[PDB]
Enzyme design. Structure first.
Site, PDB file in Angstrom:
ATOM      1  N   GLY A  34      -7.374  -7.679  10.073  1.00  0.00           N
ATOM      2  CA  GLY A  34      -8.250  -8.820  10.037  1.00  0.00           C
ATOM      3  C   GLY A  34      -9.571  -8.288  10.526  1.00  0.00           C
ATOM      4  O   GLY A  34      -9.607  -7.699  11.598  1.00  0.00           O
ATOM      5  N   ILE A  87      -3.069 -12.965  13.684  1.00  0.00           N
ATOM      6  CA  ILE A  87      -4.207 -13.767  14.129  1.00  0.00           C
ATOM      7  C   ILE A  87      -4.719 -14.653  12.996  1.00  0.00           C
ATOM      8  O   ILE A  87      -5.038 -14.171  11.899  1.00  0.00           O
ATOM      9  CB  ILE A  87      -5.305 -12.846  14.641  1.00  0.00           C
ATOM     10  CG1 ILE A  87      -4.675 -11.796  15.566  1.00  0.00           C
ATOM     11  CG2 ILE A  87      -6.378 -13.656  15.369  1.00  0.00           C
ATOM     12  CD1 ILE A  87      -3.968 -12.388  16.769  1.00  0.00           C
ATOM     13  N   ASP A 133      -8.558  -9.995   5.522  1.00  0.00           N
ATOM     14  CA  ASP A 133      -8.869 -11.349   5.991  1.00  0.00           C
ATOM     15  C   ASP A 133      -9.754 -11.177   7.210  1.00  0.00           C
ATOM     16  O   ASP A 133      -9.889 -10.082   7.724  1.00  0.00           O
ATOM     17  CB  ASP A 133      -7.577 -12.060   6.424  1.00  0.00           C
ATOM     18  CG  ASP A 133      -6.840 -11.291   7.531  1.00  0.00           C
ATOM     19  OD1 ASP A 133      -7.186 -11.440   8.720  1.00  0.00           O
ATOM     20  OD2 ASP A 133      -5.941 -10.487   7.195  1.00  0.00           O
ATOM     21  N   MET A 149      -1.379  -5.220  13.635  1.00  0.00           N
ATOM     22  CA  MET A 149      -0.155  -5.195  14.456  1.00  0.00           C
ATOM     23  C   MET A 149       0.599  -3.886  14.716  1.00  0.00           C
ATOM     24  O   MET A 149       1.705  -3.938  15.293  1.00  0.00           O
ATOM     25  CB  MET A 149       0.843  -6.217  13.872  1.00  0.00           C
ATOM     26  CG  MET A 149       0.295  -7.659  13.699  1.00  0.00           C
ATOM     27  SD  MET A 149       1.383  -8.833  12.807  1.00  0.00           S
ATOM     28  CE  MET A 149       2.920  -8.776  13.787  1.00  0.00           C
ATOM     29  N   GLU A 150       0.053  -2.729  14.315  1.00  0.00           N
ATOM     30  CA  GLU A 150       0.768  -1.465  14.548  1.00  0.00           C
ATOM     31  C   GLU A 150      -0.040  -0.317  15.152  1.00  0.00           C
ATOM     32  O   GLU A 150       0.495   0.529  15.885  1.00  0.00           O
ATOM     33  CB  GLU A 150       1.411  -0.970  13.232  1.00  0.00           C
ATOM     34  CG  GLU A 150       2.432  -1.931  12.613  1.00  0.00           C
ATOM     35  CD  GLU A 150       1.788  -2.990  11.718  1.00  0.00           C
ATOM     36  OE1 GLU A 150       2.390  -4.065  11.536  1.00  0.00           O
ATOM     37  OE2 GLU A 150       0.675  -2.747  11.193  1.00  0.00           O
ATOM     38  N   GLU A 190       0.803  -1.229   0.000  1.00  0.00           N
ATOM     39  CA  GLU A 190       0.000   0.000   0.000  1.00  0.00           C
ATOM     40  C   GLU A 190       0.832   1.274   0.000  1.00  0.00           C
ATOM     41  O   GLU A 190       0.447   2.281  -0.625  1.00  0.00           O
ATOM     42  CB  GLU A 190      -0.934   0.056   1.201  1.00  0.00           C
ATOM     43  CG  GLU A 190      -1.714   1.349   1.260  1.00  0.00           C
ATOM     44  CD  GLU A 190      -2.329   1.588   2.616  1.00  0.00           C
ATOM     45  OE1 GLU A 190      -3.021   2.617   2.770  1.00  0.00           O
ATOM     46  OE2 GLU A 190      -2.113   0.756   3.520  1.00  0.00           O
TER      47      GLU A 190
HETATM   48  N1  LIG Z   1      -5.460 -11.280  10.892  1.00  0.00           N
HETATM   49  C1  LIG Z   1      -4.448 -10.435  11.106  1.00  0.00           C
HETATM   50  N2  LIG Z   1      -3.719 -10.511  12.268  1.00  0.00           N
HETATM   51  C2  LIG Z   1      -2.679  -9.681  12.537  1.00  0.00           C
HETATM   52  N3  LIG Z   1      -2.233  -8.698  11.715  1.00  0.00           N
HETATM   53  C3  LIG Z   1      -2.970  -8.581  10.478  1.00  0.00           C
HETATM   54  C4  LIG Z   1      -2.803  -7.681   9.356  1.00  0.00           C
HETATM   55  C5  LIG Z   1      -1.720  -6.554   9.178  1.00  0.00           C
HETATM   56  O1  LIG Z   1      -0.786  -7.008   8.153  1.00  0.00           O
HETATM   57  C6  LIG Z   1       0.587  -7.296   8.668  1.00  0.00           C
HETATM   58  C7  LIG Z   1       0.697  -8.830   9.030  1.00  0.00           C
HETATM   59  O2  LIG Z   1       1.942  -9.275   9.562  1.00  0.00           O
HETATM   60  C8  LIG Z   1       0.619  -6.306   9.873  1.00  0.00           C
HETATM   61  O3  LIG Z   1       1.119  -4.987   9.526  1.00  0.00           O
HETATM   62  C9  LIG Z   1      -0.804  -6.076  10.344  1.00  0.00           C
HETATM   63  O4  LIG Z   1      -0.971  -4.766  10.793  1.00  0.00           O
HETATM   64  N4  LIG Z   1      -3.748  -7.968   8.432  1.00  0.00           N
HETATM   65  N5  LIG Z   1      -4.520  -9.030   8.916  1.00  0.00           N
HETATM   66  C10 LIG Z   1      -4.060  -9.411  10.147  1.00  0.00           C
END
Ligand SMILES: Nc1ncnc2c([C@@H]3O[C@H](CO)[C@@H](O)[C@H]3O)n[nH]c12
Ligand SMILES: Nc1ncnc2c([C@@H]3O[C@H](CO)[C@@H](O)[C@H]3O)n[nH]c12
Lengths: 235, 230
Positions: free
Chosen positions: A81, A155, A200, A176-177, A15
């Site tokens: 997610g 997750i 997801d 995660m941020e 992105e």
């Molecule tokens: N189901 C999920 N669980 C944890 N992180 C993510 C993400 C994002 O995508 C990266 C996954 O390592 C991270 O930057 C996080 O912010 N997308 N879906 C996620």
């Protein structure tokens, strides 16, 4: 107006690339293992930092960005997610708040997710949230506003997900941020808002889904960010 | 040379703060930084908050503003190595997140993308620390220290750490975050902490009871190490 600098932090290349390619008079500043792209996005001065993945990388990035570019507000973007039932891949999530879902000092009487010296949650800025909801309406996208939770784990169903759903039944998305960025902004008293797109639903198939739809998430989050910068800068 | 020092809690920072001469205080991002000299040696002491983000933010600030040559992370820890008792010292030869998990993508447990699975502490700093330990006749263990944003007090949390890092000698909440930051800037670091508890079901009580001891012992060690390096 015209003297606003909007900070944008994204963790992954995909992105960030779309936004980066749209920056005018772009320059790149490499620091602490982070790249910061300065220039204008459709006229608005922006500072875009590609942070690494995870809370610490995001914190380090957010701190560096604040310190060297002193943006007026911070927009955290990327994937997530989806947890709220009406969310489908591609849909937008806007934080009105961010909490760590993996922080736990309850043994000391702190609220779950709360770290000592920090409020249990970090509130996103009302103006920023409203602006974002304005873009959402204008772009006719499906979105949900609410609590977004962060942790240093991807997750993927099983107990990771259930624990989160149990501790934060109201959470609309997990990534995660976000909260690390919110945390740093809180400490610097800088307004923030998280605007991410679903890649997801963090279940058993989150890894393949993530793999197949990261692109669309990047497309939609980037479109929203571009739209939010515009709306924040003008109207 | 300038020794950077980071501690999370006031207790383990106050004793050192009191000894810094030619002392000045810089207050940023909710962090306090005291600069000056500890027994003649130039230092930069930072009181970071608790947890990885607070530590990262503070480490980033300390590096950015004071540019120390090396970083020493101090404070308390839950002892995991059988030889550890309250007051004893743990020296990191390495730091790893015990709560980072992106193995879904093929990364090692504890490893975050863009980072080594573990961050290695500086050999010189380690040797220096251990010379102090020997000179002070302290009981200490050198090894892997694991960090997370959870206070460990037995049950499932301790079990998960034993599973993924059976060789971890201690668990706390800032080390790896400081290591991670030091890594991005190429700054050598070493974690020197004192045991306030053994991360079991009674760690909260032990922490309360012995945090004072841990702070003095970790404090004395930082003082000695600073002098040894100089
Ligand atoms: N189901 C999920 N669980 C944890 N992180 C993510 C993400 C994002 O995508 C990266 C996954 O390592 C991270 O930057 C996080 O912010 N997308 N879906 C996620
Ligand atoms: N059993 C334990 N689990 C997690 N952290 C700690 C600590 C350290 O003490 C503080 C506990 O919240 C924090 O700074 C952390 O680094 N001591 N014992 C611990």
């Amino acid at each position: 107006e015209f003297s606003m600098k909007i900070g944008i932090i994204g963790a992954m290349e995909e992105e960030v690339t779309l936004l980066r390619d749209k920056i005018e008079n772009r320059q790149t500043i490499s620091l602490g293992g982070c790249e910061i792209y300065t220039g204008q996005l459709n006229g608005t001065e922006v500072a875009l930092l590609k942070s690494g993945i995870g809370k610490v990388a995001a914190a380090l990035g957010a701190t560096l960005l604040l310190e060297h570019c002193k943006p007026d507000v911070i927009i955290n973007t990327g994937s997530a997610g989806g947890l709220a039932p009406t969310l489908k891949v591609g849909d937008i999530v806007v934080s009105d708040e961010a909490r760590y879902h993996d922080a736990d000092v309850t043994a000391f009487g702190y609220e779950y997710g709360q770290l000592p010296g920090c409020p249990a949650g970090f509130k996103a800025d009302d103006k920023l949230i409203a602006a974002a909801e304005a873009c959402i309406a204008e772009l006719n996208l499906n979105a949900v506003r609410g609590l977004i939770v962060s942790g240093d784990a991807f997750i993927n169903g099983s107990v990771g997900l259930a624990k989160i759903r149990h501790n934060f039944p109201q959470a609309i998305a997990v990534e995660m941020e976000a909260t690390a960025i919110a945390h740093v902004c809180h400490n610097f008293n800088v307004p923030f808002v998280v605007v991410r797109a679903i890649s997801d639903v963090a279940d058993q198939q989150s890894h393949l889904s993530f793999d197949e739809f990261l692109a669309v998430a990047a497309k939609q989050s980037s479109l929203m960010v571009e739209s939010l910068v515009q709306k924040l800068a003008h109207g």
